[PDB]
Amino acid sequence: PSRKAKVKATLGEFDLRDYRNVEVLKRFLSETGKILPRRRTGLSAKEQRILAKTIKRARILGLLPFTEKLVRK
Amino acid sequence: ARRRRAEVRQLQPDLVYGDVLVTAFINKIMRDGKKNLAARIFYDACKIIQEKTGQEPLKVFKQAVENVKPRMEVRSRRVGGANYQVPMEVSPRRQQSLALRWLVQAANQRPERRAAVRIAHELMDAAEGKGGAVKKKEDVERMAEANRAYAHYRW
Amino acid sequence: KRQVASGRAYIHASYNNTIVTITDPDGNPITWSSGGVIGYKGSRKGTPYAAQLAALDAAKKAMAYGMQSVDVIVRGTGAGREQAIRALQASGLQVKSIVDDTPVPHNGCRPKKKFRKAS
RNA sequence: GUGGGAGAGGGUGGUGGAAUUCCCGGAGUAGCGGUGAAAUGCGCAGAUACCGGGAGGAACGCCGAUGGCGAAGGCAGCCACCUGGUCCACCCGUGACGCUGAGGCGCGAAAGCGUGGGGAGCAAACCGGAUUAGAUACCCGGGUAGUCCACGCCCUAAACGAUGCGCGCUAGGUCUCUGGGUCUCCUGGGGGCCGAAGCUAACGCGUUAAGCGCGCCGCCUGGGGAGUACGGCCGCAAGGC
Ligand SMILES: [K+]
Ligand SMILES: [K+]
Numbered sequence: 001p002s003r004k005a006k007v008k009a010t011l012g013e014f015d016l017r018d019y020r021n022v023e024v025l026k027r028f029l030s031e032t033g034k035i036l037p038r039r040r041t042g043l044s045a046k047e048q049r050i051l052a053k054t055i056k057r058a059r060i061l062g063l064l065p066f067t068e069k070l071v072r073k
Numbered sequence: 074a075r076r077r078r079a080e081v082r083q084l085q086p087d088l089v090y091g092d093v094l095v096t097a098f099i100n101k102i103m104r105d106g107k108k109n110l111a112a113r114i115f116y117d118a119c120k121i122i123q124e125k126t127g128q129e130p131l132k133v134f135k136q137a138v139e140n141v142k143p144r145m146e147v148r149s150r151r152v153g154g155a156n157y158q159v160p161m162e163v164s165p166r167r168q169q170s171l172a173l174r175w176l177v178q179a180a181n182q183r184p185e186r187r188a189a190v191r192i193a194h195e196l197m198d199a200a201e202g203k204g205g206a207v208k209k210k211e212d213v214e215r216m217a218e219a220n221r222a223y224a225h226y227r228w
Numbered sequence: 229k230r231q232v233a234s235g236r237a238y239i240h241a242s243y244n245n246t247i248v249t250i251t252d253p254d255g256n257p258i259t260w261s262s263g264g265v266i267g268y269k270g271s272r273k274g275t276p277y278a279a280q281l282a283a284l285d286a287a288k289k290a291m292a293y294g295m296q297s298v299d300v301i302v303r304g305t306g307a308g309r310e311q312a313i314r315a316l317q318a319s320g321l322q323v324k325s326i327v328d329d330t331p332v333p334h335n336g337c338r339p340k341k342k343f344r345k346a347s
Numbered sequence: 348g349u350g351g352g353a354g355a356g357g358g359u360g361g362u363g364g365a366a367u368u369c370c371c372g373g374a375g376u377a378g379c380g381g382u383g384a385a386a387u388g389c390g391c392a393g394a395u396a397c398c399g400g401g402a403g404g405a406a407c408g409c410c411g412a413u414g415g416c417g418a419a420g421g422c423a424g425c426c427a428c429c430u431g432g433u434c435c436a437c438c439c440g441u442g443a444c445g446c447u448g449a450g451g452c453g454c455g456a457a458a459g460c461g462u463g464g465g466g467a468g469c470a471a472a473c474c475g476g477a478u479u480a481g482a483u484a485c486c487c488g489g490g491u492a493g494u495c496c497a498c499g500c501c502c503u504a505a506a507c508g509a510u511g512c513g514c515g516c517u518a519g520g521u522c523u524c525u526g527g528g529u530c531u532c533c534u535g536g537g538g539g540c541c542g543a544a545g546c547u548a549a550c551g552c553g554u555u556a557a558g559c560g561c562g563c564c565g566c567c568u569g570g571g572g573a574g575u576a577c578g579g580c581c582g583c584a585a586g587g588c
C-alpha cells in the first residue's frame with residue numbers, strides 16, 4: 001500500500017519541468033534507476049506525466065541513470 | 074484417516090520389565106494371535122542375552138532399537154508425470170515401528186534353528202552395530218540422501 | 229597460482245542449469261563450476277542442490293588461489309539461485325555483498341515463441 | 348474572432364540507453380544448451396560463464412493505468428521543424444450560411460506482389476531431433492521468403508461497442524481525464540461502473556440509450572448449395588467488389 005512516505009509530501013516547493021535539478025529528481029527514482037509509480041510519488045496525472053519526460057531528459061543528459069543494480073538481495 | 078488424526082494406541086506395560094516398547098516387540102513377534110508363544114520366545118531370548126553378555130537384556134534391547142532407528146527415509150511422489158524418490162525425515166513413531174519390524178524380519182532371516190536364538194543373536198548384533206536390520210537402516214539412509222537433489226519435493 | 233585473496237562471484241541461474249564463475253575484482257575469471265562439472269548430467273543441473281554443489285566446488289577451487297572475501301553477483305531467475313547464495317554465504321568465503329544484475333532489456337528484440345505474449 | 352488548454356494525432360530530420368547477435372582482445376576449463384525425460388546441435392580450431400573494445404539491425408523497460416489521441420485502420424525513448432483535429436472562457440463578429448449523403452474521390456492492421464536496399468532477433472516453407480500405433484503436429488536444434496526502409500500496387504478482417512451520422516427530450520450516485528469559476532463545491536467536454544422511468548425474447552441497455560422523438564444513408568426477408576457459377580469492373584499476380 002506504500003504507507004512509508006509520499007515523495008511530494010516529503011518535499012517542498014520545486015519545479016517539475018526542470019530537467020537539470022538532480023538532487024530533487026533522484027528522490028523520485030527507486031532503488032533502481034526506474035521511475036517510481038504514482039503510489040510512491042503521490043503526484044497527480046499531469047504532474048506525473050511531466051515528471052516522466054523531465055526525468056527522461058535528465059537521463060539523456062547523463063544526470064540520472066537508466067538503470068541500477070539491486071543490493072542486499 | 075481422513076476426518077480425524079487417528080490417535081495412537083497405548084499399549085499395556087511389560088509384565089517383567091514394565092516397558093511398553095517390550096510389549097510392542099512382543100506384538101511384532103506375535104503370529105496368528107499367539108501372545109503366550111511370542112512372550113515365551115522373547116523371554117527365552119532375554120535368558121539367552123545373559124550368560125552370553127553380562128549386561129541386562131533391557132539395555133541391550135533398547136540400545137539395539139536405537140541403533141536400528143532410521144533418521145531419514147524416501148517416499149515416492151508423482152510430479153510432472155514421472156515418479157521420483159524424494160528423501161525426507163521420519164517421525165519418531167515410524168522410527169520405532171520400522172525398527173521393531175526390521176528387527177523381527179531380520180531375526181527370522183537368520184540361520185539359527187529355533188526362534189529364541191534368532192531373536193537373541195539379532196538383538197545382540199544390532200546392539201553392537203551389525204546384522205540385517207542395521208543393513209536395512211543403512212540401505213534406507215543410502216536411498217534417502219542418495220536422491221538429495223529431490224529434497225525440495227519434501228511436502 | 230595468483231593469490232587473489234579477494235574477488236567477485238557471478239551466479240548465472242537458469243531453469244535448466246546454475247553455473248558459478250569466480251573472478252577477480254576486474255572480472256577476469258579464476259575458476260568456475262556448474263551442474264555439469266559435478267556428476268549431474270541432465271535436468272538435475274537445474275536443481276537447488278546441484279547449484280549448492282556447484283557453488284561449493286567453485287569456492288573450494290578458489291580456496292586453492294587463497295581467496296577469502298567475495299562479492300556475489302546474481303543473474304537470471306532460476307531454481308537454485310538462493311540456494312547457491314546460501315551455499316557461498318557459509319563456505320569459508322566471506323560474502324561482502326549480494327547484487328542482482330539480471331540483464332533486463334528495454335523491449336529490444338523479439339523473444340522466441342516459448343517466451344512470447346510479451347515484448 | 349480574441350485569449351488560453353491537454354494529447355503515443357500525422358509527416359521529416361537528428362539523437363539516447365538497456366538487451367540480443369557477430370567480431371577483436373584479455374582471462375579461463377569440460378561442457379554448454381535443451382526437455383516430462385531426452386536426443387539432434389554447438390564445444391580441444393578452447394564453447395558456456397566473466398571483463399573490456401568494436402559493428403549492425405530492430406524494438407522502446409520503469410513511467411503506464413480500469414489513462415490519453417484519432418473518423419476508422421491505428422498511434423508509446425528523446426529533441427527539433429512542419430501540420431491536422433479538438434476543448435474551454437469572453438458574448439465580440441456573420442445572420443440559417445444547416446443535417447444526412449446514392450455515385451465519385453481519398454484513407455485503410457496484418458499477410459501478399461513489383462523494383463531496389465537492408466537483414467540483429469524472430470520466423471511460413473524446408474532440413475533435422477524427439478514424441479506417437481502413425482506425428483506431414485504440439486515439444487527441441489537449425490533455417491528461406493518475410494518481418495525492416497524507399498517508391499508503387501494490393502482493399503481483406505472477430506476493419507468489434509458484432510451498436511451508421513446529427514439534433515432535441517427524459518432521476519441520480521460513484522470513479523476518472525481535462526479546462527473554467529464565487530476552487531467544501533459549481534459548471535463544461537471526454538473515458539468507466541451502479542442504477543429512476545422506460546425498453547428488450549431474455550441477457551442486458553439505461554444523459555456515452557439498445558429509452559422517447561425527428562431527418563437522411565446502408566442493409567436484412569429460412570438453412571444448405573454459396574460468397575460458389577456466369578457476366579462485368581478492378582488487379583502484375585494472389586485475388587477483390
Ligand atoms: K558430449
Ligand atoms: K484505451
Ligand SMILES: [K+]
Nearest residue numbers: 464465466492
Ligand atoms: K531478397
Ligand SMILES: [K+]
Nearest residue numbers: 504506507509
Ligand atoms: K460487418
Ligand SMILES: [K+]
Nearest residue numbers: 526527528530
Ligand atoms: K480547478
Ligand SMILES: [Mg+2]
Nearest residue numbers: 178179205209
Ligand atoms: Mg529385511
Ligand SMILES: [Mg+2]
Nearest residue numbers: 244245270271
Ligand atoms: Mg539442464
Ligand SMILES: [Mg+2]
Nearest residue numbers: 355356357422
Ligand atoms: Mg506525436
Ligand SMILES: [Mg+2]
Nearest residue numbers: 371372373393
Ligand atoms: Mg575469444
Ligand SMILES: [Mg+2]
Nearest residue numbers: 380388389488
Ligand atoms: Mg546450440
Ligand SMILES: [Mg+2]
Nearest residue numbers: 388389488489
Ligand atoms: Mg548453432
Ligand SMILES: [Mg+2]
Nearest residue numbers: 387388389390
Ligand atoms: Mg561433436
Ligand SMILES: [Mg+2]
Nearest residue numbers: 376391392393
Ligand atoms: Mg588440446
Ligand SMILES: [Mg+2]
Nearest residue numbers: 368394395396
Ligand atoms: Mg556468447
Ligand SMILES: [Mg+2]
Nearest residue numbers: 398399400401
Ligand atoms: Mg561485450
Ligand SMILES: [Mg+2]
Nearest residue numbers: 369402403467
Ligand atoms: Mg552485419
Ligand SMILES: [Mg+2]
Nearest residue numbers: 409410411412
Ligand atoms: Mg505497462
Ligand SMILES: [Mg+2]
Nearest residue numbers: 416417537538
Ligand atoms: Mg477520443
